A paper describes a structure:
Although the majority of the tegument disassociates from the capsid at this stage, three tegument proteins remain capsid bound: pUL36, pUL37, and pUS3. Like pUL36, pUL37 promotes translocation of incoming capsids to the nucleus. We recently determined the crystal structure of the N-terminal half of pUL37 and identified three evolutionarily conserved surface-exposed regions: R1, R2 and R3. Our results indicate that the conserved R2 region in the pUL37 inner tegument protein rectifies this motion to produce sustained retrograde bias.
We previously mutated three evolutionary conserved surface regions of the pUL37 tegument protein (R1, R2, R3) in PRV. Each mutated region consisted of five alanine substitutions. Although plaques produced by the R2 mutant were smaller than wild type, all three mutants propagated to wild-type titers. Remarkably, the R2 mutant was avirulent despite propagating to wild-type titers in culture. To determine if the stark R2 mutant phenotype resulted from misfolding of the mutant pUL37 protein, the crystal structure of the pUL37 N-terminus was solved and overlaid with the previous WT structure. The five point mutations did not affect the overall fold of the N-terminal half of pUL37 as judged by the alignment of the wild-type and R2 mutant crystal structures (rmsd = 0.55 Å). These findings demonstrated that introduction of the mutations did not contort the pUL37 backbone, and encouraged us to further examine the R2 mutant in cell culture infection models to identify the specific source of its avirulence. Whereas wild-type HSV-1 and PRV capsids preferentially moved in the retrograde direction in axons (towards the neural soma), capsids of the R2 mutants moved in an aberrant bidirectional manner best described as “ping-ponging”. Firstly, the PRV R2 mutant failed to spread to the TG following inoculation into the anterior chamber of the eye, which was consistent with the HSV-1 R2 mutant defect in vivo, and pinpointed R2 as a conserved effector of alpha-herpesvirus neuroinvasion. Taken together, the in vivo studies recapitulated the results obtained with primary cultured sensory neurons: R2 is required for retrograde axonal transport but is dispensable for anterograde axonal transport.
Residue numbers in the entry: -1 to 477
């Protein structure tokens, strides 16, 4: 514990010698001990009083940097459990900026207005917590999205939390963990909103709409039953032309696959949440021959995933959707091209398996389906993490590093150059963190040191090269 150690140290007295206290401060300046909000709150008043007292009984430069920027130095390594939300951080800030902090620093001849001082930190972390609370006010459950399928660009996910006003907070651990938390709680809803929009799209055919309904039930509701989803599926299913089913008594009429069993059990019962058949229960399966495409909409043929995966009988047209996926320059673009075309997360997984089983001798039309599904499965892995922070940089790097071992052997067969898959994923999902903020925080902390040096009549101080080496290590170790 950095604050804890600092308190023990400065408590040893010996304040009548400047360098003994000047070393105990330089240690903390570079210590690694992470803090907790309750732990800072419980130690703040004493730690700040010590700092203030170390500077009143030494006058040295490092004591004054420590006291003036103790607020930001202590926040920088704070580890917060974001399930508790902002209130523990506001409560902390309340202690940091209380009247005893201003009296302690004022009475010591120091400032309250350093960039990482109690005034700047209280004002800025308060605005940030306010932005955080606002970013979490969205849809709490899938039922909310189904009622209001608002489409949120993931490019906007947590963006108010990394605006320039908060540049000097950006490298703090609790900020980076909060971006991660916000991403985790917002991005999942976009594929659901896009699917709900198709299911409710009155310019699509009933079979198309009925299948989108079933993908929604399976990806986002499992066994939790939504009455609107039930109502939507039954209305579309009841209007599906009976010409789309294999008639009873034909060879291979029975549903052949886990997918076909699930689609058939729902249609037969008019119930999205029926997924099995009673052994002996007669269920018509959907045709998977090229003719059944006439019952689908041209742009979303893959939403009938059993037909699109029946490659020896049927070739779905995925050239248009591959054109849009391959030209996508943002998360919103690529996810919207994927989901509206029927390349949900599960369909990407199934169509990737069905096409790569034909490798290396693919036709151009199959390669279009396989590129869409392959890129698609990477996008769906990345989407829930997409954000402007270091966590998404970590998550993207881990996913990108798996692409060559997964697909190095089949990219030529798909018509892609070497690293073709990484090329497309980078173009629409590459991390876009405002890394300039790292430099802004370092500049700010070092300006405060500069002021301390000049105040102490120094062209250079020990505090500078120590804080420098701490910040310099974090910028390389993290970013
Ligand atoms: Ca945490
Ligand atoms: Ca907790
Ligand atoms: Ca927790
Ligand atoms: Ca709790
Ligand atoms: Ca077949
Ligand atoms: Ca066959
Ligand atoms: Ca075109
Ligand atoms: Ca997979
Ligand atoms: Ca095989
Ligand atoms: Ca993770
Ligand atoms: Cl988290
Ligand atoms: Cl098959
Ligand atoms: Cl096949
Ligand atoms: Na603003
Ligand atoms: Na590696």
């Amino acid at each position: 514990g950095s604050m804890e150690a600092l308190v023990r140290a400065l408590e040893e007295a010996d304040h009548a010698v400047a360098t003994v206290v000047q070393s105990r401060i330089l240690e903390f300046f570079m210590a690694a001990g992470r803090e907790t909000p309750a732990g800072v709150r419980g130690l703040w008043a004493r730690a700040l009083r010590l700092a203030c007292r170390a500077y009143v009984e030494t006058g040295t430069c490092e004591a004054a940097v420590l006291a003036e920027n103790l607020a930001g130095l202590a926040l920088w390594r704070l580890r917060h459990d974001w399930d508790e939300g902002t209130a523990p951080l506001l409560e902390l800030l309340g202690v940091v900026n209380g009247d005893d902090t201003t009296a302690a620093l004022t009475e010591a001849g120091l400032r309250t207005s350093a960039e990482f001082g109690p005034d700047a930190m209280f004002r800025l972390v308060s605005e940030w917590c306010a932005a955080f609370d606002e970013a979490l006010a969205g849809a709490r459950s899938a039922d909310d999205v189904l009622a209001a399928p608002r489409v949120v660009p993931p490019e906007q996910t947590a963006r108010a939390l990394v605006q320039p006003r908060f540049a000097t907070l950006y490298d703090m651990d609790f900020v980076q963990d909060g971006l991660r938390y916000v991403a985790q709680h917002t991005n999942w809803a976009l594929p659901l909103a896009l699917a709900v929009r198709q299911m409710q799209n009155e310019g699509l055919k009933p079979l198309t709409r009925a299948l989108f309904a079933l993908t929604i039930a399976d990806e986002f509701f499992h066994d939790r039953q939504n009455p609107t989803l039930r109502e939507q599926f039954a209305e579309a299913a009841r209007a599906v032309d009976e010409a789309a089913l294999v008639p009873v008594g034909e060879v291979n009429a029975t549903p052949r696959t886990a997918v076909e069993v699930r689609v058939s059990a729902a249609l037969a019962h008019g119930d999205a949440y029926v997924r099995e058949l009673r052994p002996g229960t007669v269920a018509r399966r959907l045709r998977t021959d090229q003719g059944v495409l006439a019952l689908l909409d041209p742009g979303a043929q893959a939403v009938h995933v059993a037909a699109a995966a029946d490659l020896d009988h049927t070739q779905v047209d995925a050239t248009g959707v591959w054109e849009a996926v391959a030209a996508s320059a943002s998360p919103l673009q690529v996810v919207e091209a994927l989901v509206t075309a029927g390349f949900t997360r599960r369909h990407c997984d199934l169509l990737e398996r069905a096409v790569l089983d034909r490798a290396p001798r693919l036709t151009a039309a199959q390669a279009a389906v396989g590129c869409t599904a392959v890129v698609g499965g990477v996008v769906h892995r990345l989407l829930d993490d997409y954000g402007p922070g270091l966590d998404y940089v970590r998550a993207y790097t881990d996913v990108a590093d798996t692409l060559e071992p997964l697909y190095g052997d089949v990219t030529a067969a798909l018509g892609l150059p070497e690293k073709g898959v990484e090329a497309v994923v980078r173009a629409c999902m590459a991390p876009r963190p405002p890394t300039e903020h790292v430099g802004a925080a370092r500049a700010a902390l070092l300006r405060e040191v500069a002021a301390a040096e000049r105040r102490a009549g120094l062209a250079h101080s020990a505090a500078r090269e120590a804080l420098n080496t701490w910040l310099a290590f974090r910028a390389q170790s993290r970013w």
